[PDB]
Structure 1
Amino acid sequence: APLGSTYIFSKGGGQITYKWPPNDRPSTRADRLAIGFSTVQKEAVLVRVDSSSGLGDYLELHIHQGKIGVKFNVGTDDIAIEESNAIINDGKYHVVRFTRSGGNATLQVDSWPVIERYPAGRQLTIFNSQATIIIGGKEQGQPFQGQLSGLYYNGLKVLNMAAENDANIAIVGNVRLV
């Protein structure tokens, strides 16, 4: 189960935001995103990384009809991958792992088979000018309720950073440490 900081998200919702310095936003050709979670929800946004580049690039981990999935867009089309079978909303700890290299991507939950997505046609490869990581909710999305831990995004252990009141972190709403 979890290592390090855990946040509980209670009814009504809350959101932790990591905001990169505006003159030092990363653009990446490959990404790794993982998070640990426990919940009984059927619909929730867990994590979303948004860009400031006006190109619309994004990466989102969410639960839909009780199943964990990823949707992302690095410039071409919206790519959606769902782990359609793993039970993830039994209130027990689960880990979801996402990777991307260019336009290709994988998703895996727990010890279930890795899902490998190789989209057809022209694909862009850079996740441009990443501006914010939002955790536990988003504008136009349904807020997470449960516990989140072990958020790793391209090397950043975001929830541990939140736990020490990193200066790039903001926390709002109904969410608290452990």
Structure 2
Amino acid sequence: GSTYIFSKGGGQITYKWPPNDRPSTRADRLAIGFSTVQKEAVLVRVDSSSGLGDYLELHIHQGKIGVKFNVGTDDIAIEESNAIINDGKYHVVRFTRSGGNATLQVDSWPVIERLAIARQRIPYRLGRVVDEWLLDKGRQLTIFNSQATIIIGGKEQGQPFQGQLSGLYYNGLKVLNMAAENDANIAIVGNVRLV
């Protein structure tokens, strides 16, 4: 609903949990709509408190949307490698995590149906789901500990997002809506504006 345009030079929307409600979770739900033409960008990153490795990162690499996270132990990647999503068009991404398991869903509305065939078409929903499962007898770690910041825009990774982000949802937090409503725990910097 609340859409922010990240213009030339990039920008950043930061949400800081009250230093005293910093959550630790077994499961996560993230949703965001986006449009971009970028080959590479970081869209959203949830980092833990200083001194901890835990993080969750939504990014685009080689035109493809994916999420990388760490919850103690190994870095875990889930990527949707069939859709090229950097076409300046709208897409919705949905990510869930349960311990080391993870699901990623990417919806798109292509207007083309393919010796491929350039057939202009009525746009239709094309959904892709990827599930990643780990099979140890509950052996690796499962908790994203002490979540401190949700940073939207990718500047801190040296990979700024340019284009449109909307409708961010994270564990009950409608972060871009809270930004729009001038939430005390949100800071906006750079070339970012509310549509």
Structure 1: distance between partners of 2:77 and 2:30 = 15
Larger Rg: 2
8 Å contact kept, 1:53–1:129 = no
Q: Name 1:84's counterpart in structure 2.
A: 81
8 Å contact kept, 2:29–2:170 = yes
What root-mean-square deviation, in Å, do the aligned CA atoms of Structure 1 and Structure 2 show?
Answer: 3.6
Structure 2: distance between partners of 1:45 and 1:17 = 14
Normalising by structure 2, what TM-score? Answer: 0.82
Q: Output one character per residue of 1:124-178: Cα deviation in whole Å (capped at 9) or x when no partner.
A: 1111000000001142331000000010001111000000110000000010001
8 Å contact kept, 2:37–2:87 = yes
Structure 2: distance between partners of 1:90 and 1:114 = 12
Structure 2: distance between partners of 1:75 and 1:149 = 30
8 Å contact kept, 1:83–1:109 = yes
Q: Output one character per residue of 1:92-151: Cα deviation in whole Å (capped at 9) or x when no partner.
A: 1101111101111111101699999xxxx8321111000000001142331000000010
8 Å contact kept, 2:46–2:151 = yes
SS at match of 2:38: coil
Gaps of 5+ in 1: none
8 Å contact kept, 2:93–2:106 = yes
Structure 2: distance between partners of 1:68 and 1:114 = 20
8 Å contact kept, 1:106–1:114 = no
8 Å contact kept, 2:155–2:161 = no
Please report how far the alpha carbon of residue 53 of structure 1 lies from its aligned counterpart in structure 2 after TM superposition.
5.7
SS at match of 1:55: coil
Q: Output one character per residue of 1:19-40: Cα deviation in whole Å (capped at 9) or x when no partner.
A: 0011110111100011100011
Q: Name 1:156's counterpart in structure 2.
A: 173
For 1:101, which of 87, 98, 102 is the aligned residue?
98
**Cα distance change of structure 1 residues 12 and 111 upon mapping to structure 2, 3 Å threshold:** closer
Instruction: State how many pairs are aligned.
Output: 171
The structure 1 segments of at least 4 consecutive aligned residues displaced by more than 2 Å after TM superposition are 111-116
8 Å contact kept, 1:32–1:154 = yes
For 2:72, which of 72, 75, 81 is the aligned residue?
75
SS at match of 1:139: helix
**Cα distance change of structure 1 residues 133 and 114 upon mapping to structure 2, 3 Å threshold:** farther
8 Å contact kept, 1:106–1:115 = no
Structure 2: distance between partners of 1:143 and 1:67 = 16
Please report how far the alpha carbon of residue 51 of structure 1 lies from its aligned counterpart in structure 2 after TM superposition.
0.3
Normalising by structure 1, what TM-score? Answer: 0.90
SS at match of 2:46: strand
SS at match of 1:156: coil
Structure 1: distance between partners of 2:150 and 2:111 = 24
